[PDB]
A paper describes a structure:
The conformation of the peptide in the HLA-I groove is paramount not only for HLA-I-peptide affinity and stability, but also for the TCR-HLA-I-peptide interaction. To study this aspect, we individually refolded and crystallized HLA-A*02:01 with spliced epitope candidate KRAS5−6/8−14 G12V, non-spliced epitope candidate KRAS5−14 G12V, as well as two control peptides (peptides #1 and #2), in which either the N-terminal residue or one of the central residues was substituted, as compared to the epitope candidates. The global superposition of all these four peptide-HLA-I complexes in the peptide binding groove reveals a similar binding orientation with a root mean square deviation value (rmsd) of 0.124 Å.
Two peptides - peptide #1 YLVVVGAVGV and peptide #2 KLVVVAVGV - shared a large portion of the KRAS5−6/8−14 G12V and KRAS5−14 G12V epitope candidate sequences. Peptide #1, which has a K to Y substitution at position 1 as compared to KRAS5−14 G12V peptide, is transported by TAP as efficiently as the non-spliced epitope candidate. Specifically, while the N-terminal and C-terminal ends of all four peptides match perfectly, structural superposition reveals conformations in the middle portions of peptide KRAS5−6/8−14 G12V and peptide #2 unique from the remaining two peptide ligands (KRAS5−14 G12V and peptide #1). In the latter two cases, the middle portions of the peptides containing P4, P5, and P6 residues bulge out of the binding pockets to accommodate both peptide ends inside the peptide-binding groove of the HLA-I molecule.
Numbering used by the authors:
A (entry chain B): 1 to 99
B (entry chain C): 1 to 10
C (entry chain A): 2 to 274
Amino acid sequence: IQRTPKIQVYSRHPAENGKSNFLNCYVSGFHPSDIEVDLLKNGERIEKVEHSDLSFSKDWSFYLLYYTEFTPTEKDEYACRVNHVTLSQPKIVKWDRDM
Amino acid sequence: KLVVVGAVGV
Amino acid sequence: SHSMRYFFTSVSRPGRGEPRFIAVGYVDDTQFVRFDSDAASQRMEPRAPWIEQEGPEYWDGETRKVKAHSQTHRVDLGTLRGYYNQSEAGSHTVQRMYGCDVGSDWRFLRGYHQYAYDGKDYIALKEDLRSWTAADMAAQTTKHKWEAAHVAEQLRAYLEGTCVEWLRRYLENGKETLQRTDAPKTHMTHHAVSDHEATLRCWALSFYPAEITLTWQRDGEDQTQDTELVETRPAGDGTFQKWAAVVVPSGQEQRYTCHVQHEGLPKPLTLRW
Ligand code: NA
Ligand code: NA
């Protein structure tokens, strides 16, 4: 009855240090729809984060895109933190630069 | 354009 | 082919107040309208430039209809709690999807109207648009009600009429984007994973529509072993992304080809390192 979210963390454009970009957290395949998604900069919640309107797939599982403008640097670490009824603790997925 | 006829309840 | 689809989600709030209701409209893989019960406007809102040209009668009409949809879902959450003998204490979800496809001939191809309760099939209109698939005895009760109320006849009239006519209107008004294919921008990357092995990753970026096939071949035969294929994902600018990777012996990269199939490609692309 409950399906756990799949998580992808990626940039809209090829990541280049000092070039403005968009950080994406795509959460899919989850049920029910209530979900907490935060984008993290060096472990700290980013404020200006927007998300797509709730929609769902043929199997009725939900998907959302969470996103923020960001400028990648050599030092700064980005991640997506997801909480859902199917998770005993919030799941943190690190942004892998070329994934 | 959405369905115009009122939706029938389950 | 082209599609118009509406998606509705209603989630009950047992602690206080009425269900959260979210409606979204799509043409193909492009969102064009939304309603969110939690938003300030309490209106159907545009989400594509080509729907903004619709006049006030359109926005008033779609707002009236989507609010009526929200009240139907609110009532249905109550009815379904009854059918399944569930307490008032739990949150539950109703989902509805309906819409229509036009084919290569720009004529009606197929219609659909599907309902789910708590993420499981409940009742669905069959492809003939004349019969219902009821998953269980709660849905069988609904089927008997909808047969008596001639719901399939009402939906058939919409799906073969209004639905395809307005899909064709939207496709013309939005043709600059809706009838433009964006072929995937493809490249391969190479990363050593050991002294003896390398990962080849085949990228498909900035494509529209979302439907794509990435396949690896070794010496001209399909290979699935030692491969990874990520779910197609939105870029956030209306286009999509996907990649497929294969682990290969270092020095043997030339044996491997990535094959990309997409509506925007006259012939499939072959990439080689
Ligand atoms: Na890469
Ligand atoms: Na690679």
